[PDB]
């Protein structure tokens, strides 16, 4: 059924999962027209799917000729995503196909559903976590290649770097999701907490930090106050 | 006008025929229904006085032979049977017409109603719905499952419903998902009704059946398909004219027959808003509409 709390450890089992987040797929500026009325313009999306064992990220590039001359896009977008994980999973060799697709809203059910019906033993959950991925935006390599893509495209990533050589992906995805709650909470301080130290790099091929496992908890402690503060700041507590 | 004679009345019984019932009281002398109309199905059903558990019935058309009731103590039902022997069925319902021991159908000169709920119900389709081919009538009761239902346990007593569901490949073409799941129309014109039912008479007929078998019985699945059926129509944005007008006339019948204290568990929610409300069709059920929202506001 739902993935929640009481059966988190599941992610890290070995029934091969993904996740498939769709809430930067359809991305739009609001602005004025010279008449005063409004208007949107779409940017470029993505879809975020990822395997919270391996860290292997699909990033599905949604670019903006994908809604021209289409309507009701943000029903669309939905469709559009099942699509494109659809085909993921048709291209993908059958032991290496997943077991379960875990979507993070579930407007994606059905959409998903009626895509996949080819794939009777592929389990389509919904989720009760409030999962951050929608800050992967945040991620300046990731929101880079989405920005400059000029055709549709599939980049892959693997979004733990190299910590599953030296944590388990338990670990990993904990981490993986502080960094991006802190983000999506607040992304300017979040971000100078990742970057404030000069000598502590991004190695060209990685998409964080290159921390020690002693900097790693420095970093992960400053992320949870950054965390609570923002909640206080924002509940005044 | 023809007739349904009992054997006997032995154990108490409220009887209902169509849309009427009578209660009959344990070995009253009652000996069965005469002046049924001719050119319509037809069922006669049971609920007994000790256990309200199990209503169950018999669809019958009296064009199709000489039908009779007799209780079967074994069984512990009213069992519907055929007598071939057309001199002793004439003789004994004569006798128990002149002992004025029947009922009579009370059908009031206006009334249109039963016409109505059946306009599109044959006894040959109700038969494949309903498999018992030694018989040329059909027994129906609360519990059978449908076809459907079997696929989520005995065969032979299952109610074989044309199969229905949203979120299958017959109901969606590769490349139309998004297409095909958010307008029904595909899935109603070429798969269901070009395909299977073959016309909107056969396709209303089995809505038809599948409404009378979960009023008068309760029948959990019926209900289910009867839903299924209108809301594939209402889901549809390309429906003929014609099919659209029907459907109103004929659940604004159904609405209008059913019994108010009933309608809690026998309209899905769900259903009736989004096909009233929401759907393509949402503006061209005018009487369905009217009767829905000025006899139970309170499901809307
Ligand atoms: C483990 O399965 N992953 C793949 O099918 C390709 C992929 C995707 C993202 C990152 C790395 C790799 C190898």
Redesign the interface.
């Known amino acids: 059924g739902a993935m929640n709390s009481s059966n988190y450890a599941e992610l890290f089992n070995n029934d091969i999962k993904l996740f498939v987040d769709d809430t930067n797929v359809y991305r739009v500026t609001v602005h004025k027209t010279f008449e005063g009325n409004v208007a949107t313009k779409a940017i470029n999306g993505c879809i975020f799917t990822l395997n919270p064992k391996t860290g292997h990220l699909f990033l599905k590039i949604i670019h903006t000729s994908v809604w021209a001359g289409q309507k009701r896009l943000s029903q669309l977008a939905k469709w559009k995503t099942a699509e494109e994980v659809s085909a993921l999973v048709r291209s993908l060799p059958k032991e290496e196909q997943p077991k379960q697709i875990i979507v993070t809203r579930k407007a994606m059910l059905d959409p998903l559903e009626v895509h996949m019906l080819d794939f009777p033993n592929i389990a389509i959950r919904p989720t009760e976590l409030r999962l951050p991925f929608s800050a992967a935006m945040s991620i300046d390599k990731l929101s880079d290649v989405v920005m400059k893509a000029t055709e549709p495209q599939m980049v892959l990533f693997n979004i733990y770097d190299d910590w599953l050589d030296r944590i388990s992906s338990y670990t990993a995805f904990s981490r993986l999701t502080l960094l991006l709650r802190a983000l999506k909470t607040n992304e300017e301080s979040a971000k100078m907490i990742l970057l404030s130290d000069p000598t502590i790099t991004i190695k060209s091929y990685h998409l964080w930090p290159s921390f020690t496992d002693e900097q790693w908890i420095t970093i992960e402690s400053q992320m949870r106050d950054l965390i609570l503060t923002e909640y206080g700041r924002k509940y005044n507590v | 006008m023809n007739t349904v004679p009992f054997t006997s009345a032995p154990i108490e019984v409220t009887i209902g025929i169509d849309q009427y019932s009578f209660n009959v009281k344990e070995n009253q002398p009652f000996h069965g229904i005469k002046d049924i109309p001719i050119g319509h199905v037809h069922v006669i059903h049971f609920q007994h006085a000790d256990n309200s558990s199990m209503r169950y019935g018999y669809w019958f058309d009296c064009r199709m032979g000489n039908f009779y009731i007799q209780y079967d103590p074994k069984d512990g039902l009213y069992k519907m049977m055929e007598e071939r022997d057309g001199a002793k069925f004439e003789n004994i319902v004569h006798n128990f017409k002149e002992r004025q021991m029947m009922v009579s159908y009370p059908k009031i000169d206006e009334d249109d109603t039963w016409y109505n709920l059946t306009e599109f119900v044959q006894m040959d389709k109700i038969r494949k719905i309903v498999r018992k081919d030694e018989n040329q009538f059909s027994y129906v009761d609360s519990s059978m499952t449908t076809v459907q239902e079997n696929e989520l346990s005995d065969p032979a007593h299952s109610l074989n419903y044309t199969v229905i569901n949203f979120?299958?490949?017959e109901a969606?073409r590769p490349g139309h998902?998004?297409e095909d799941?958010l307008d029904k129309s595909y899935y109603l014109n070429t798969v269901m009704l070009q395909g299977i039912f073959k016309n909107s008479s056969n396709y209303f007929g089995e809505l038809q059946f599948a409404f009378l078998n979960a009023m008068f019985f309760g029948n959990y699945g019926s209900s289910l398909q009867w839903h299924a059926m209108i809301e594939l129509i209402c889901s549809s944005a390309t429906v003929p004219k014609h099919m659209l007008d029907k459907l109103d006339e004929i659940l604004y019948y159904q609405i209008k027959t059913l019994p108010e204290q009933y309608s809690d568990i026998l309209l899905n929610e769900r259903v009736w808003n989004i096909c009233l409300y929401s759907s393509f069709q949402k503006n061209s059920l005018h009487n369905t509409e009217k009767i829905m929202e000025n006899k139970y506001p309170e499901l809307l």
């Open positions: 979120k299958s490949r969606i998902e998004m799941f």
